[PDB]
Amino acid sequence: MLLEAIFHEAKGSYAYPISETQLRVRLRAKKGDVVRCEVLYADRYASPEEELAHALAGKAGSDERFDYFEALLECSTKRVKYVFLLTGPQGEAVYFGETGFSAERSKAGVFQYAYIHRSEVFTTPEWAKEAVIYQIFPERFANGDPSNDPPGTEQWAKDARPRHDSFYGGDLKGVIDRLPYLEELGVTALYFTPIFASPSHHKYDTADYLAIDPQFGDLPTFRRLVDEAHRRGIKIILDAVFNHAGDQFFAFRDVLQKGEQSRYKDWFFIEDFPVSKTSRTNYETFAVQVPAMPKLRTENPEVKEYLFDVARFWMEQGIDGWRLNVANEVDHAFWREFRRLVKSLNPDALIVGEIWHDASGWLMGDQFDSVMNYLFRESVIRFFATGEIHAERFDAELTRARMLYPEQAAQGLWNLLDSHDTERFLTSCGGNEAKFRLAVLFQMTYLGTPLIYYGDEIGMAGATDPDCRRPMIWEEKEQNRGLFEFYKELIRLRHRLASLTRGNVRSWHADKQANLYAFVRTVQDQHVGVVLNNRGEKQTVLLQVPESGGKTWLDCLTGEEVHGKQGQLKLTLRPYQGMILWNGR
Numbered sequence: 001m002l003l004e005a006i007f008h009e010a011k012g013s014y015a016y017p018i019s020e021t022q023l024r025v026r027l028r029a030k031k032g033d034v035v036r037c038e039v040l041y042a043d044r045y046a047s048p049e050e051e052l053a054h055a056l057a058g059k060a061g062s063d064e065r066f067d068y069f070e071a072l073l074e075c076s077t078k079r080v081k082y083v084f085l086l087t088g089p090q091g092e093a094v095y096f097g098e099t100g101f102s103a104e105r106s107k108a109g110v111f112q113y114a115y116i117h118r119s120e121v122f123t124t125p126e127w128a129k130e131a132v133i134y135q136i137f138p139e140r141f142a143n144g145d146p147s148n149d150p151p152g153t154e155q156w157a158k159d160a161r162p163r164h165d166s167f168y169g170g171d172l173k174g175v176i177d178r179l180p181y182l183e184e185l186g187v188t189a190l191y192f193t194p195i196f197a198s199p200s201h202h203k204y205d206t207a208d209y210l211a212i213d214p215q216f217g218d219l220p221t222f223r224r225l226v227d228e229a230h231r232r233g234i235k236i237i238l239d240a241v242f243n244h245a246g247d248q249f250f251a252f253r254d255v256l257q258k259g260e261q262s263r264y265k266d267w268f269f270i271e272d273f274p275v276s277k278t279s280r281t282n283y284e285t286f287a288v289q290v291p292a293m294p295k296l297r298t299e300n301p302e303v304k305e306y307l308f309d310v311a312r313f314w315m316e317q318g319i320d321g322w323r324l325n326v327a328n329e330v331d332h333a334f335w336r337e338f339r340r341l342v343k344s345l346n347p348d349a350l351i352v353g354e355i356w357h358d359a360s361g362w363l364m365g366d367q368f369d370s371v372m373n374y375l376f377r378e379s380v381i382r383f384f385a386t387g388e389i390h391a392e393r394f395d396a397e398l399t400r401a402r403m404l405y406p407e408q409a410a411q412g413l414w415n416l417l418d419s420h421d422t423e424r425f426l427t428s429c430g431g432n433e434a435k436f437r438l439a440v441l442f443q444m445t446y447l448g449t450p451l452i453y454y455g456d457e458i459g460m461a462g463a464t465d466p467d468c469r470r471p472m473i474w475e476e477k478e479q480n481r482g483l484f485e486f487y488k489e490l491i492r493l494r495h496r497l498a499s500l501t502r503g504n505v506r507s508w509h510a511d512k513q514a515n516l517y518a519f520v521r522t523v524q525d526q527h528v529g530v531v532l533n534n535r536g537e538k539q540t541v542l543l544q545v546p547e548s549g550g551k552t553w554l555d556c557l558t559g560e561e562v563h564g565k566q567g568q569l570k571l572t573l574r575p576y577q578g579m580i581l582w583n584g585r
């Protein structure tokens with residue numbers, strides 16, 4: 001049993017509260033090293049004479065190299081100390097504690113979770129768990145007011161190939177006019193990219209955080225969108241760029257004019273003025289040389305209050321949350337305080353961050369509710385699209401990601417297939433609608449919150465930016481209504497089956513050879529097994545029947561298949577077919 005591979009910590013994603021009285025504990029070890037893993041615990045002040053409590057940690061999954069065991073400690077005192085009992089294949093057992101590994105339970109020591117504060121229990125908005133987000137790029141969704149259109153706008157047509165600097169006249173009024181379409185599809189929330197005032201084409205360099213860009217609409221119209229959206233049960237999530245401002249931002253406008261005499265000089269990172277935004281820069285900007293985007297000194301108490309006041313203003317308009325662009329570059333303190341402000345104004349307000357790497361340090365409960373699950377996509381692209389990887393490998397990747405953050409976060413990660421920065425998933429599938437659909441089937445049933453990129457529902461395709469930003473197809477006869485209907489039904493199943501939104505995930509079956517994958521979602525007595533045949537050939541397989549839900553199963557897409565035959569289930573799947581097996585509870 002390789003002791004150097006066993007890992008655990010009384011913090012982070014390995015030991016964290018799910019309530020003021022319940023503590024989840026996680027443990028990692030070499031694949032096939034531990035057969036059974038038990039946990040003995042008791043209050044931190046219990047007498048040495050007292051018998052310890054027992055918790056059996058079932059294997060929650062396994063990846064490319066590690067096994068993951070998960071336990072649930074009951075702590076009525078709100079304090080807890082514990083040790084692990086690990087048993088190997090050959091029957092050898094060993095105790096694992098803070099002190100180390102030993103056959104002696106005392107020499108092993110004991111891990112400690114000092115105390116559990118109700119305020120430190122990771123809590124996220126209930127609606128975000130069963131929501132279905134829809135990403136809207138205002139400029140290209142629906143142009144409901146042609147008098148909004150900027151000079152040089154191009155005609156709105158199907159056979160259109162966008163350019164980096166093209167314009168189509170998309171606005172907020174169109175979003176309103178098209179709400180019925182969205183409600184029908186079943187979207188629960190709408191995500192808008194930056195829509196604040198900006199002289200640029202992308203609006204990432206904000207000019208006035210307190211005003212809507214004339215091109216998309218105005219304050220009154222927004223208010224109306226909010227109401228019409230809310231009235232139809234749809235939340236509005238706005239995109240905010242607080243890491244940097246645009247070259248037009250009033251405060252930068254002042255320093256570029258008043259130099260060191262400006263009372264706003266400490267609001268940016270300026271080396272030596274006289275601020276020279278000519279072509280070289282004497283101030284720190286966004287990526288490298290991007291004068292149009294001066295970084296803001298969020299650490300400065302004066303700046304924080306401004307951004308904080310900005311958040312305050314928009315929350316008065318009824319927005320339901322924020323997506324924080326380039327968040328990993330803002331001090332944690334700011335974020336901890338931002339959370340407080342926001343949750344205090346609206347506890348159901350959602351906070352989503354943009355980090356393209358391990359977002360662990362921002363996912364413990366005091367900063368963000370979740371982030372864009374970039375791992376999810378990278379994994380789906382390679383499995384369903386290109387086929388660079390197989391099901392057994394796939395299973396490992398999905399697991400690897402899941403164990404990264406606390407479950408409260410995992411259930412909230414935004415699972416996208418594409419965005420304005422990638423090509424349409426249809427293109428990745430080489431136009432194969434067969435593959436694409438199976439990917440959506442997965443997306444709508446896996447652990448996390450589905451994020452639909454505007455237009456994917458009607459079968460739109462295109463290469464990466466800007467070919468990924470083609471004007472929405474509003475022609476009934478030019479839309480793939482087959483897919484539209486397909487999306488509607490998957491989304492519908494998601495809202496009625498608790499397992500798909502509030503249940504957990506466990507690997508059910510994965511064949512490297514058949515490239516067939518299956519997983520199971522369980523909440524209380526409900527069980528829904530998903531089978532995926534990622535092959536263009538008809539195949540049949542025998543899956544074990546998890547010891548909990550019954551001998552009868554129903555495919556929510558087609559019809560019954562009660563194959564409970566002595567612990568097995570015989571399933572014949574058509575090429576690229578997927579099944580949603582519900583145990584009926």
Ligand SMILES: OC[C@H]1O[C@@H]2O[C@H]3[C@H](O)[C@@H](O)[C@@H](O[C@H]4[C@H](O)[C@@H](O)[C@@H](O[C@H]5[C@H](O)[C@@H](O)[C@@H](O[C@H]6[C@H](O)[C@@H](O)[C@@H](O[C@H]7[C@H](O)[C@@H](O)[C@@H](O[C@H]8[C@H](O)[C@@H](O)[C@@H](O[C@H]1[C@H](O)[C@H]2O)O[C@@H]8CO)O[C@@H]7CO)O[C@@H]6CO)O[C@@H]5CO)O[C@@H]4CO)O[C@@H]3CO
Pocket residue numbers: 164202204286287288290325326327354356420421
């Ligand atoms: O605020 C800007 C930007 O923010 C968001 O972008 C996020 C993005 O969604 C995430 O995917 C991630 O980005 C990482 C990226 O995915 C990685 O691949 C990698 O990037 C490498 C590139 O792949 C590589 O090609 C090269 O990039 C250089 C470009 O080739 C070069 O041309 C230039 O870029 C200029 C653009 O070409 C030009 O069009 C203009 O871009 C504007 C966008 O069009 C506009 O939509 C918006 O972009 C948002 C984006 O939509 C958000 O989602 O504003 C842009 C203006 O800044 O101007 C560009 C600048 O002149 O320069 C680049 C870089 O030098 O190398 C990179 C090397 O890393 O890493 C990326 C970051 O880690 O995260 C971002 C941030 O949250």
